[PDB]
Amino acid sequence: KVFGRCELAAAMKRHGLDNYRGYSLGNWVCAAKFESNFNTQATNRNTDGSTDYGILQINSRWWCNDGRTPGSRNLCNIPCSALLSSDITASVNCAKKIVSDGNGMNAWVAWRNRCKGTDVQAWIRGCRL
Ligand SMILES: [Cl-]
Ligand SMILES: [Cl-]
Ligand SMILES: [Cl-]
Ligand code: NA
Ligand code: NA
């Protein structure tokens, strides 16, 4: 599913990401834009052999099982395919675990490099929330 900007904003807000661990909604929308272009089906291989899955590009090295990442934790107790569904619940629930683990949203390289320190509010401007 390729989300609209405000459509994803409203879905993440419904799932409680707005101000979760102090990260305003625009941070999560910005990160999704640059991680996945709002596309739940996005998959990308990392340098280390693992793969990133879904709207927030969650990694199989630690967070989900994709059956091909040696030394893999599955800390969200989920097949990585569950992160590709039109329903973003698994992605959001797993992301809440990641962002609660110490490094906040710096776990998302695209957030760190393209959202952090920017006007993340624009990403939810114009949305009815
Ligand atoms: Cl629209
Ligand atoms: Cl585990
Ligand atoms: Cl919660
Ligand atoms: Na915001
Ligand atoms: Na894994």
User: Residue ranges per domain, the chain?
Assistant: 1-129
Q: Which of 26, 30, 32 is nearest to 13 (CA)?
A: 26
Establish whether 48 is a catalytic residue: no
Is 18 annotated as catalytic?
no
Annotated binding site for substrate: 101
Q: Tell me, in angstroms, the distance from the centre of ligand 2 to residue 94's CA.
A: 13
Q: What separation in Å is there between the alpha carbon of 102 and the centre of ligand 1?
A: 35
Residue with tokens 């390729």: 2
Of residues 7, 48, 52, 119, which has the active-site annotation? 52
CA distance 109 to 89: 22
Query: In a 3-state reduction of DSSP, which class is residue 61?
Result: coil
For 16, what's the count of Cα atoms within 13 Å in the CB-facing half-sphere? 8
Cα separation values, 82 from 57, 103, 104, Å: 12, 24, 23
What is the CATH code for 1-129? Answer: 1.10.530.10
In sequence order, which residues have a C-beta less than 8 Å from that of residue 67 and are 6 or more positions away? none
Q: Which of 7, 18, 35, 66 is catalytic?
A: 35
User: Distances from the Cα of 68 to the Cαs of 36, 43, 50, 90, in angstroms?
Assistant: 21, 14, 8, 20
88: left (phi over 0), alpha (psi -120 to 50) or beta: alpha
Structure resolution in Å?
1.7
Amino acid at 22: G
What's 71's DSSP letter?
A: T
